[PDB]
Structure formats: C-alpha cells, structure tokens
Write a protein that binds this ligand. Structure first.
Ligand SMILES: [Mg+2]
Lengths: 83, 94, 110, 99, 94
DNA sequence: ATTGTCATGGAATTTCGC
DNA sequence: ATTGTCATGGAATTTCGC
DNA sequence: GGGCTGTGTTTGTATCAAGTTACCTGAATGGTAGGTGGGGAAGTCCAAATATTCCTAGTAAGACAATTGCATTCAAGGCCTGGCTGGTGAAACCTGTTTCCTGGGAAG
DNA sequence: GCGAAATTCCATGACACTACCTTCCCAGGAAACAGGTTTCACCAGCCAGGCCTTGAATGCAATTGTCTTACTAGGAATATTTGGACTTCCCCACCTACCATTCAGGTAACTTGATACAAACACAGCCC
C-alpha cells in the first residue's frame, strides 16, 4: 500500500517540540528540511535491518522484538518492549 | 505458552528496601528488560572471555571479570563484593 | 517413597533472584558447554545488586514527587541522576521517559 | 481438487504407503534417472539444461517388446528426428488413422 | 605450536585480480585480522539468529541473513550473489 | 470406493539355405 | 581371502482308537 | 501595579494492580556415577626492561612581525508570538479476515 | 474307516545407522491487525508585526607564527639481566547426564484494594 507525502507528516511544531526537549531556545526555519532528512536516514537503517529478521523467520508481521533486535544491532538498545 | 521472566523476583527485591511501594506494569517490563540485557552483557562478555583463554568453562571467576568490565567505578566495587558474599554463603552450605 | 525437603538454591545463598533459572540460561544459550555450579549463584547476586540500585534510586524519586508506585519517568530520572549508573547505560534509551530538566544557562531571558 | 474439477479431471489416488500402485510413473522415473544419469557423467549436474532432451530422447525410444515409438502410438508418425521411419510414407494418412 | 591463519588464502586471491602484485608482512596481518573479525561478525550474528528462532542449526540460509545485515547497500547485493554461485556450484558437485 | 512395470541380456526358439 | 535365518501360523501329515 | 501560567490540594472511580489460590505442569531438586576438563607444579627458553652513552635532532626559547581575533557599532533580516481557521488525528466501537502459532498430524 | 487328535511342514518376512523436510491440513483461538465508521476537540497550518539576533564592516591589540640558537633527551644499539608466558604432565572434583519426586510459578480467576487521573478553585512565583 502506497501513501506518499508522509515525510511531510513530521509537522513544523512537532519538530519544534522535539527541539524544546533537547534544550533549544531559538531555531531556524531550515532545520525542518534537515530533520526530515536525518530522520529518514535513521529509518532506512532500522527497517532495512528489521525486515531481514522478519523475512528470515518467514513472518509477515514485523513484531516488537524485531525492531529491538535491529536497534540491538546498531548499538542503541531499547528497553521496555522486550529483548 | 510459557514466557519466563524476572517479574516475580523484582517484588522480592522491591519489598526489601521499600516495603510500602508498588510498581506499575509498564515499569516492570523495564526492570524485566533491564535484567535480560544486563544478563547477556555479563554472560556475553564472560562467553568471549572463554575463547580468549582457550577454556570451555564459565567459572565463577569469569563472571567476576565480566562485571569489573561492564560496571564503571563505584558499582564495580560493590557488585563484586555483593557477589562474593552470596557465594561464600552458598558454598559453606550444601 | 518420599524424599527430603527440597531447599531451593536461592534460599541456600541468601539471594532473591533464582539460581535454578539462571543455570538453565547458561546451558541453553550456548554460552559454553560446561557451566560451574557456582557461576549462576554468583551471577544471580550481581543481577540482584543492580536491581536494587536502580530501585533504591527509583524509590527516592517516587517519594520526592509524592508517588506510591514507580512509573518509568522515575526510572528515566533515577538513571542519569547517578553518574556511574549512567555510564553503564550511556547508549540506552529508556522508553516513555523524556529527558532530565536542563538549560545551558545562556538562553535565560533578557 | 478444485482446479481438477474445472478441467474434467477425475483424480485418482493410490492406496497410502503403496508406491507400487502408481505403475508407469515409478517406471519412467527409473528411466529419467537413467537418461539424466548417463548424460551427466563426469560433469556438474546441470540437469535443467537437459530436460528438453529427455522428453525427446525417451519419447523416441522403441519399446523393445512392443516395437514402436511413443510418438507413433501417441500421434501416428515420426516427427523430424534422426532415424525416423519411411515405412509409413508408402501409405495414405487419411486411411492409416484406422490402421 | 600451530597458529592457524588466512594468510595463504590471500595470495590465492591477490594473484587473481592483481597477478603482478606482492603484499607486505604487516599488511598481511590486517587482511588476516580483517577476516577473523568479519568472520565472527557474520557467525556471531548468525549465532544469535539461531536463538531468535529457536533452532540449534546454522543453515546456509542464516549466513545469508547475517550478511544482509552487516554489509551495507551495494556490498549486500554482490556478496549474496557471490555466495549462491559458490553453493550451487558446490551442491551440483559431489 | 482401487490394481506394478518394463527395459534388458543370456538363452531358448524359429527361420531357412541348400 | 568368505556364506542368511529362524520364529510362526494355516495346512498338510501321521497317529491311533476301536 | 497587574497578570498569566504553572502548581497545588481534595474527591471519586475506574482501572490497574495487588492478592490469594488452584492446579499441573514445568521445572526444580536430590542422589549418584562417570569421565573430562582444568588446575596446579615444573622447567628451558623467551621477551622485555634496564643501565649506558652517544650523538643528534628537534625541543625550547627569545625576538619579531602581521594577521587574526575580538569587541563595538551598524544595519536589517529573520524568527518568535499570537489571533484564527479548519482538517486530521485520536479515541471509542465492530469485525472479518488474516496470520500465526506452536502444536500435532499425514505422506512422500 | 472316519474322525479326532497329536505332529511335522514350509513359505515368508523382517532385521540391516536414522531424523528431517516439504507441503497441506487441522484447529482453536486469538491476535491484533488491517479495515472502516464516528465524533469531538486539538494541534497544525496561516499570516504579520515587532524586536532581537546575526552578519558585516572595522580598527586595533596581542596573539600567534616564524626564524634562529643553545641545548636536552630520545632513540638506538648493547650487553645483560631479569622476569614470565606458555608448553607439559597428571589427577581429582566438579559438572553433567538421569529419573523420580515434589514444589513453585504462571496462568487464571474472582475479589479486592488502592492510586492515579481528571476536574475545580485557589495559591504562589515570576515576569511585563
Ligand atoms: Mg512419490
């Protein structure tokens, strides 16, 4: 199923609100075309590593431990969902 | 079927230093998955300590070195001495 | 016939984390072929010191913000408050936590 | 079976654990593994190349106790093969159907 | 005693694509230790693929997934197809 | 509501030569 | 410088009764 | 002097968890016999660390020169904030379907 | 001589090292999920005005970069001296493999219990 224009779903306040959690007061208007780029790099290195686990067990559902196993691979461990 | 866990053994530690304290479901899974991760760091460094010294044997010496590597500074002083109590108490028994 | 009283090995060492369950997670995880009888004892102690040290610190932050139960925000905040606990979990995200309160003291208003 | 009822296929199954019931296919599988065995002596078994050979080499082996090709008993005359009969070219095809 | 190595099997690859080329001693050890490290990444991810799917068996399918994880992008397209040639050539033999 | 088979080489057999 | 076998139930066989 | 947003205190119930248990099986223990792995004691040989000097190279330093870095002022642009509108996201409801999900089973 | 009973006969099949592997079935349930409807409230998108921050231009001051010299210590080669890692050989205790027995935990259920959230009115802290 194909639904495009959804890198533009990461809206303009929801990058500002993520900026405020990092402790950032004033931002530019050109981070919005940088953040959407660095985000899709990070999801093209997790979903590419997650699907090769789900294809390997011949599952059609990328389950909760799969993503945690992908994040185990990169060296960014996620607790709380298992694994 | 059966999912093994460390959830029961948290209430036997939570009710040791904070006996009037509950703990939520979604916070159990963190202390559940804290254990399984900090398990296989210590095991998976004691494992690779077996190959580095050409032995097929995980002793209780090799778990001690694989805790002085993963834990930094002041945790590496306590969690060593909080294990050698539980071994010397164990071996004097049985 | 009957047999003696089955005394668990977690009660024969004064721990709370099991040693029977740890000793079948060193022979079904392919870590090595032989696993000593004292190794899952010694490992269930180190799993028990570090389970206290978070929950000791997670008990305080629950108390300092007037809470009975420990929600993951406290686990988020008990970690990264202690220095040496943070250097263990320096790479590790805790789910549903947010960050510590922090301003770089240059963004303060004028 | 639901495809087989479309064609008019009457499916027939053997009695279980009885491979002797399926008669000819257990014989020709001892033919295919004696043709593809003989071709593939002394080379890597690249047998996907040699499958158009087999249903043209076995289908023109004379049955040595019937003395006919599989081609003749199926069609009636040989195709352009090496060593094909001219003994049927002295006849009319419009009448050798009932022959 | 005996130190096993991959040093000999480099000259059987160095003299395939650059037949007029030598290689130094201290550069052999890099391509020696490149192999032993890239060995146990692929094995040590195929190993942990055995536990994740509850099998005691390292197949030649599990090495293929533990190469599509470690190698990025365009190496993951070639080193898969540079293995399935060497298996299909292998299994049609013997 | 199903069931051997059939290529294959001694060896026996038939043709038949004159 | 080696080679079937042997328990087992119809079924045929023998005993034998008088 | 006033105002706004964050903050606190109190109540009720829903939800989440705490509770106790019933069983039942899974697993956890007890007692043993066996072999193997490892641990321990030894030795010739091995690799590193030292005591030395010697010489040399670059390290250390003193002087000088010029650029850069800094601090200020100038100019305006860019961004933050807010008064507003609406389109979607989410929460609650219903389900059929699809996939799994080990697990058992048949058959070639 | 027929029948009943006691006996010998002989044609035959299975034992040879065995489990996996594949694909379809079954199945119950459940897993949610993918699908879809529904509604309300909220978060995002819109646009502009004011101000503050950044960028630039600059002059200058010291910081820094280069040049030069006396020199200290690093490195290498040496002899030697010394400190040990690993190879070696052997034995014992410890781990394992096993079954039987039993206990404990996980699921599960019914109940209970307790806390957190949502709401409302007010208080306090900080800022314009
Ligand atoms: Mg078949």
């Amino acid at each position: 199923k194909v639904l495009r224009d959804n890198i533009q779903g990461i809206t303009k306040p929801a990058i500002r609100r993520l900026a405020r959690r990092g402790g950032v007061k004033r931002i530019s208007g050109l981070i919005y075309e940088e953040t959407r780029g660095v985000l899709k790099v990070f999801l093209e290195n997790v979903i590419r590593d997650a699907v090769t686990y789900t294809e390997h067990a011949k599952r059609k559902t990328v389950t909760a431990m799969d993503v945690v196993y992908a994040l185990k691979r990169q060296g960014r461990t996620l607790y709380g969902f298992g694994g | 079927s059966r999912k093994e866990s460390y959830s029961v053994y948290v209430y036997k530690v939570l009710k040791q230093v904070h006996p009037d304290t509950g703990i939520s479901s979604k916070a159990m899974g963190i202390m559940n998955s804290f254990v399984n991760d900090i398990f296989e760091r210590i095991a998976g460094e004691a494992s690779r300590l077996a190959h580095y010294n050409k032995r097929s044997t995980i002793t209780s010496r090799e778990i001690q070195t694989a805790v002085r590597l993963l834990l930094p500074g002041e945790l590496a002083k306590h969690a060593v001495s909080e294990g050698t109590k539980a071994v010397t108490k164990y071996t004097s028994s049985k | 016939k009957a047999r003696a009283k089955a005394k668990t090995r977690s009660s024969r060492a004064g721990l709370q984390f099991p040693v029977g369950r740890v000793h079948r997670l060193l022979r079904k995880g392919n870590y090595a072929e032989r696993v000593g009888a004292g190794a899952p004892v010694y490992l269930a102690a180190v799993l028990e010191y570090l389970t206290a040290e978070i929950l000791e610190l997670a008990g305080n932050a629950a108390r300092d913000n007037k809470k009975t139960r420990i929600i993951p925000r406290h686990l988020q905040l008990a970690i990264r408050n202690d220095e040496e606990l943070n250097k263990l979990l320096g790479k590790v995200t805790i789910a549903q936590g947010g960050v510590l309160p922090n301003i770089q003291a240059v963004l303060l208003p004028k | 079976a639901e495809w087989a009822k479309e064609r008019g296929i009457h499916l027939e199954f053997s009695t279980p654990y009885h491979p002797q019931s399926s008669g000819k296919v257990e014989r020709k599988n001892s033919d295919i593994k004696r043709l593809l065995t003989k071709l593939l002596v002394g080379r890597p078994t690249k047998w996907y190349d040699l499958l158009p050979v087999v249903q043209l080499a076995l289908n023109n082996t004379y049955s040595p106790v019937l003395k006919y090709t599989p081609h003749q008993l199926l069609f009636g005359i040989d195709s352009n093969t090496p060593f094909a009969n001219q003994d049927t070219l002295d006849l009319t095809r419009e009448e050798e159907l009932s022959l």
